[PDB]
Amino acid sequence: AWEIPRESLRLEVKLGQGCFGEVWMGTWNGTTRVAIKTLKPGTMSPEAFLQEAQVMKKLRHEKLVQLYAVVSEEPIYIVTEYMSKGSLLDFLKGEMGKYLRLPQLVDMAAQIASGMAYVERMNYVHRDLRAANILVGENLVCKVADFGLARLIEGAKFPIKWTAPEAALYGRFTIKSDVWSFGILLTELTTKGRVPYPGMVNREVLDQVERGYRMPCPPECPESLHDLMCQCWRKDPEERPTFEYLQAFLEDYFTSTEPQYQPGENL
Numbered sequence: 001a002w003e004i005p006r007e008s009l010r011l012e013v014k015l016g017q018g019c020f021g022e023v024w025m026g027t028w029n030g031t032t033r034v035a036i037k038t039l040k041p042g043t044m045s046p047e048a049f050l051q052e053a054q055v056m057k058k059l060r061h062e063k064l065v066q067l068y069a070v071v072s073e074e075p076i077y078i079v080t081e082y083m084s085k086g087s088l089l090d091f092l093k094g095e096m097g098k099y100l101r102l103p104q105l106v107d108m109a110a111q112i113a114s115g116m117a118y119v120e121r122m123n124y125v126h127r128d129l130r131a132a133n134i135l136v137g138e139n140l141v142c143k144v145a146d147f148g149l150a151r152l153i154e155g156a157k158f159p160i161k162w163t164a165p166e167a168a169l170y171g172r173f174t175i176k177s178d179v180w181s182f183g184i185l186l187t188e189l190t191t192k193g194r195v196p197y198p199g200m201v202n203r204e205v206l207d208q209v210e211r212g213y214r215m216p217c218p219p220e221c222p223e224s225l226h227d228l229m230c231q232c233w234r235k236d237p238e239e240r241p242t243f244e245y246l247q248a249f250l251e252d253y254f255t256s257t258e259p260q261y262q263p264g265e266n267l
């Protein structure tokens with residue numbers, strides 16, 4: 001049903017690479033610009049790679065990168081929507097990050113929250129929500145990507161700095177652990193791509209977080225945005241906001257919450 005013959009696409013330009021496989025910009029049927037996720041034949045089991053596609057089959061939303069097709073035979077390809085701007089993390093860290101201010105950044109957060117609100121409604125967990133897994137298109141369109149770890153609320157190792165402590169400690173992955181991650185994502189947005197918990201390693205992060213440590217308000221970030229971050233980081237997962245709440249709070253932000261916002265040098 002999602003199967004297409006491989007001769008239907010042509011891999012044009014290389015975009016990303018690793019021990020994982022490759023990522024290619026290409027054309028499908030000689031008309032549609034696509035993105036093509038290749039696997040290096042022998043780095044992970046055939047369907048552990050392909051599970052990403054199988055979750056992407058179940059989930060369609062305008063703020064989630066959308067699965068186009070799959071070639072099941074080897075070499076195996078996952079075909080998806082092409083995002084012209086690449087990674088949110090890279091975008092934020094690069095020459096385009098200089099000129100982004102709170103209004104653009106809050107709008108990007110609100111789009112990501114919209115995508116996550118859908119994931120919430122569908123009884124899924126993403127498990128890997130972070131700026132490196134948000135993709136940017138034209139006109140500052142942000143979409144959540146990389147559903148490899150996503151499963152239904154009926155892995156092996158997880159980035160302590162973005163993972164809710166109950167999920168890192170005891171494997172308690174809920175939509176509320178994804179809310180925790182979204183709060184971390186909000187610091188990526190307001191520090192322009194900086195790694196969370198500067199100068200702290202993983203082991204330091206865990207016990208700090210367990211003892212009640214939370215990141216401070218980033219410079220030029222309104223306290224009301226930091227307050228929202230800290231709600232996302234409540235110790236009790238059920239004390240954390242819904243994505244429905246986050247989406248609406250972020251959409252309405254400059255009327256309801258900061259009607260007096262004045263642009264600074266960075267935010």
Ligand SMILES: Nc1ncnc2c1ncn2[C@@H]1O[C@H](COP(=O)(O)O)[C@@H](O)[C@H]1O
Binds near residue numbers: 023081083086145
């Ligand atoms: N669907 C896509 N459209 C455009 N660029 C992509 C797409 N998927 C991945 N990339 C790029 O290739 C890299 C590959 O890493 P990954 O996010 O695992 O696919 C990303 O960081 C992006 O820079």
